């Protein structure tokens, strides 16, 4: 009932065995080595798409690089997913999450725009949420160069990218884009860059994760909050879009995704809360290393598909 | 959903046109006319079933009347739904909720056992939850009197019957029955009868509902609380079965269902929280008077089906 999946144990062993630069092996985590290691073992290939296209989105600090993923070359008007990557083991960009965004596009049969928002410390807050909001409003306008007619937005993101989902949804709630946000899907969201990581002894499942693995997740959280800066949404959640919130059972910050789901329910916002029992923080980009993550991701995508179908059915009824 | 649905506004005008609450209560003849009115306008007919069978369940206060609904005359082994009715606009029995339990059995394609648990003031607390637990344990043993073998339980109930779902799921969590409870579906649960009904002032949608309508829901809630009694589930919710929790947008006690869904999420229990925007307390037996309630119920049934499918994949 308290457990670690066997593929999860293997990944945690792989993390503990990662040597350092020939400079000094010891306890070694050069971002360069992490980048090589995670690119190699983490996720499946991007694979085949009808559309895989670089975009340039006009933004308040210059052009925002983005990328369109679509199983189809062309399609009827419908929703578009806008994706905000999180970070941790790697800083994160279009390449780190590209296999996930391609697979999301295939399973939901919808176009996915992934956003390469400005990172800290090069670009202070509020560059990251400004870019995410600019990108959502641009997609919502159905720009000629996108080659898609967009009738609604779905926002998706992982870890601190999850908080970029929450803050962008709240911004478009307060000042709507051309079309509405009809669903949010934050994966294991990190909802407060101000909040200190739990210590080993404060996590009830610490004994299952082990101190050495928990140190990895702590380091990832700290690095992520350094690079991906957004404000906690501590105010009223009334009028936020219907949600799928997914946590990791072995994630020391599972309480952050749980509390967001709980606050949505208390405000009367529909929410599907799921927890990946015996899986870790960061699983959506670990679908090769930890194949049991596929089931976790597919369960989230099925819930999101139900919200989208119901949301479009309720709009066809109202009109 | 547009603050008050047109069909809901029509039902509230219908309610205002009946003889209504006096000194914050429904007296005996007012309630009597309301019950005939609700029987005449509320729900569609029971309709066609492959099985519609009366049952007698042994319980700690005598026999417990129950009724099996099933579209199929005969079926492979599978989950069984146990249903614990609520009340308020109806007294609550096998007849008042029969159309709902029949439609639940058809849509899910599963047997539903509705339970006629002992009521107060004749049988005081804890007869109701005792009967509900006994009935669930009985169904779990796959008794010969059902023509059906049971691999798992699903618990479902409305209003004070929603709290019988919660208390019963907790009892079977602590001391398992022969098969597990794989899902819970409380509709607009009343989770703490000892709490005061919200005032017109305290309910944020009071102005949409109107004072006269609010007095009706308050009187109907008091009438239900007299008949159907269980105490709040007090401890840790960890280990509780995966849930679909449905509230009413115009229901003064929506905070109770919202808070239950929120407490499940905090404990790491998977939960689908849904709120029927612009619909009222008691909609699951108002599918004829308020046809828009069909969409609310089918949405809850679709989410419940996803839980059952995932529960049986995993096993
Ligand atoms: Cl922000």
Numbering used by the authors:
A (entry chain A): 3 to 321
B (entry chain B): 3 to 317
Q: What do the authors report?
A:
We report the biochemical features and crystal structure of a novel esterase from the family IV, EH0, retrieved from an uncultured sphingomonad after a functional screen in tributyrin agar plates. EH0 (optimum temperature [Topt], 50°C; melting temperature [Tm], 55.7°C; optimum pH [pHopt], 9.5) was stable in the presence of 10 to 20% (vol/vol) organic solvents and exhibited hydrolytic activity against p-nitrophenyl esters from acetate to palmitate, preferably butyrate (496 U mg−1), and a large battery of 69 structurally different esters (up to 30.2 U mg−1), including bis(2-hydroxyethyl)-terephthalate (0.16 ± 0.06 U mg−1). The typical H-G-G-G motif and the G-X-S-X-G catalytic motif are conserved, and EH0 clustered together with family IV esterases. As with other reported family IV esterases, EH0 has an α/β hydrolase fold with two different domains, a cap domain (residues 1 to 43 and 208 to 229) and a catalytic domain (residues 44 to 207 and 230 to 324), constituted by a total of 9 α-helices and 8 β-sheets.
The crystal structure of wild-type EH0 was obtained at 2.01-Å resolution, with the P212121 space group and two crystallography-independent molecules in the asymmetric unit. While E53 and Est8 are monomeric enzymes, and EstA is a tetramer, EH0 is presented as a biological homodimer with approximate dimensions of 6.3 by 4.9 by 2.7 nm, which is assembled in a twofold axis symmetry arrangement that buries 5.6% of its total surface area. EH0 has a long catalytic tunnel with a very narrow entrance (approximately 16.8-Å depth). The structural superimposition of these proteins reveals a high conservation of the corresponding catalytic domains and also a common spatial arrangement of the helices at the cap domains in all the proteins except EH0, where α2 and the long α7 are visibly shifted very close to its EH0 active site and are apparently impeding the entrance of substrates. Thus, withdrawal of the cap domain seems a necessary requirement for allowing access of the bulky substrates to the EH0 catalytic site. A deep inspection of the active site showed that the nucleophilic Ser161 is hydrogen bonded to Glu226 from the nearby α7 and a movement of loop β3-α3, including the oxoanion in the conserved motif 87H-G-G-G90, compared to EH0 homologs. Additionally, at the beginning of α7, Trp218 is within a hydrophobic pocket surrounded by residues Phe13, Ile17, Leu28, and Phe219 from the cap domain and Phe91 from the catalytic domain, which is also anchored by interaction with loop α1-α2 and Pro23. In our study, some flexibility at this region has been found from the two conformations adopted by loop α1-α2 observed in subunits A and B of EH0.
